[PDB]
Amino acid sequence: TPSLRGRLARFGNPRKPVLKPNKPLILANRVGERRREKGEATCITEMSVMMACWKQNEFRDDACRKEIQGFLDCAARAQEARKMRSIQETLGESGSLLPNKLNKLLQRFPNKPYLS
C-alpha cells in the first residue's frame, strides 16, 4: 500500500502537497455496483463469411447453406450465452463476492472515522 505520510497538505507538513484528493481518503461502508460490460456486436466474423459467400454466389442460399448455418448457430450461441451470462451475474460465482453481500459485510464492520 502506498504511503500517505507527508502527502496531503496539512499543518506541520513542510513540503508542498503530493496528493490533492477531491474526496477524503476515508473508506466508505459500501462498494461500487457490479458494473456491466458494454456489449459488443457479436458473430461478426461468421456474418462476414456468410456475406462474402453471398457476394460470390449472387446471394443464392442453396450454395451458401453451410456458412448460413454456421452464422445462425453462432447467433443462437451468442443469445444463449447472453442469457447464461445474466444467470451467472445473478449467481456471482466469477467474482469473489457479489456487491450486495459485500455491502452487507461492510455494514457489519463499518469504518469508524470518528470517536465515540
Partner: protein, 208 residues
C-alpha cells in the same frame, strides 16, 4: 387475463400421453406427476388434436384474418391449398414420366418449403447514432424469421398490382413461385440480404 398465473397452457398431443411409462425418464415422470396438481387453461378453439392440424397453416390463416372473420380466412386458406394441389396435378399429368417424379403434389409440403425459402436470415435494425439513423445488420430469431416470411407473403398477395385476381389464386401462384425460389417475395428477401451486405460495415454499431 381471466386466467390466474397458476393456470398452465394445455398440451394437446395424443402421443405425449400414450407414451409408455417405461420409456419415461425421471424428469418426464416428475413433470407428469406434477401436472396432475396444476390448473390447466381451457383448450383454445383454434387448435385441436386432429391429425390434419398444422400450426404453421393455422398461424397463416390467423394472419390472413381481417376483423375476426376466421371463417373467411379459413376458406381462403383451404381454397389456396386446393388451387396449389390442382395446379400441381395439372403439371404432373402434363409432364413426362421423368418429370413426374420430381414434381411435388403435397400442398402442405409446398407451403412449408415456400415459407422456409422466403425466410430471411439477416435483418436490419434502425439505430440512432450521431444524430443519424443507420440500418445495422442483425441476426434474427427463428420466430421473427417465420413471421417475416408469412407477413411478406401476405403483403405481396394483398398488393394492388394484382387486379381482380382472387386471394386463393394469387396466394397459390406466389407459393408455387417461392417453392421454386422465384417471385416478388424471394426478391424482397434478396433485397434485404443485399442491403445488409452493403451495410455490413455498420455491424459494429450494434451493442447486442
Amino acid at each position: 387475463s381471466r386466467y390466474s398465473p397458476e393456470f398452465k397452457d394445455p398440451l394437446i398431443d395424443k402421443e405425449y400421453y400414450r407414451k409408455p411409462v417405461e420409456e419415461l425418464t425421471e424428469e418426464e415422470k416428475y413433470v407428469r406427476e406434477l401436472k396432475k396438481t396444476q390448473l390447466i387453461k381451457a383448450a383454445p378453439a383454434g387448435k385441436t388434436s386432429s391429425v390434419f392440424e398444422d400450426p404453421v397453416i393455422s398461424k397463416f390463416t390467423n394472419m390472413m384474418m381481417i376483423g375476426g372473420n376466421k371463417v373467411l380466412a379459413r376458406s381462403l386458406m383451404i381454397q389456396t391449398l386446393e388451387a396449389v394441389k390442382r395446379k400441381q396435378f395439372e403439371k404432373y399429368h402434363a409432364a413426362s414420366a421423368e418429370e413426374q417424379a420430381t414434381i411435388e403434389r403435397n400442398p402442405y409440403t409446398i407451403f412449408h418449403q415456400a415459407l422456409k425459402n422466403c425466410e430471411p436470415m439477416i435483418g436490419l435494425v434502425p439505430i440512432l447514432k450521431g444524430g443519424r439513423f443507420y440500418q445495422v445488420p442483425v441476426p434474427l430469431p427463428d420466430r421473427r424469421r417465420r413471421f417475416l416470411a408469412m407477413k411478406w407473403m401476405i403483403t405481396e398477395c394483398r398488393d394492388k398490382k394484382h387486379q381482380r385476381t382472387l386471394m386463393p389464386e394469387k396466394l397459390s401462384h406466389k407459393l408455387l413461385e417461392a417453392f421454386h425460389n422465384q417471385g416478388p417475395v424471394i426478391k424482397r428477401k434478396h433485397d434485404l440480404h443485399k442491403m445488409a451486405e452493403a451495410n455490413r460495415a455498420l455491424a459494429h454499431y450494434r451493442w447486442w
